[PDB]
Amino acid sequence: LTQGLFRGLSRQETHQQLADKKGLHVVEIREECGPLPIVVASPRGPLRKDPEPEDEVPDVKLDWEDVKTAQGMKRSVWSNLKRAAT
């Protein structure tokens, strides 16, 4: 668990790194901030003019636990329990 935790956190991709790789702006959308587009990272080099291909159906692998929780089908007496501040 300890070695796994440091492995993933070391390999996370920052927004600035993603913007540089894709050559595009990374825009943050916050529900609290409404529809206001917020630029968190911009590529230092040339900026691409062609938009990313908007795939109608993304081919990504979904964890069943996340989907089941989202649909409310996951009941658990041990979830969302009130606990001390961390």
Task: Decide: is 8 part of the binding site for another protein (CB under 8 A).
Answer: no
Q: Kindly tell me which residue out of 71, 75, 76, 79 binds another protein, with binding defined by CB under 8 A.
A: 71
Which DSSP letter does residue 68 get? Answer: H
Q: Kindly tell me which residue out of 1, 49, 75, 76 binds another protein, with binding defined by CB under 8 A.
A: 49
**Cβ 75 to another protein, closest distance in Å?**
13
**Cβ 15 to another protein, closest distance in Å?**
7
Question: Phi-psi category of 2—alpha, beta or left, where left has phi over 0 and alpha has psi -120 to 50?
Answer: alpha
Beta bridge partners of 76: none
**Cβ 6 to another protein, closest distance in Å?**
23
CA distance 69 to 71: 5
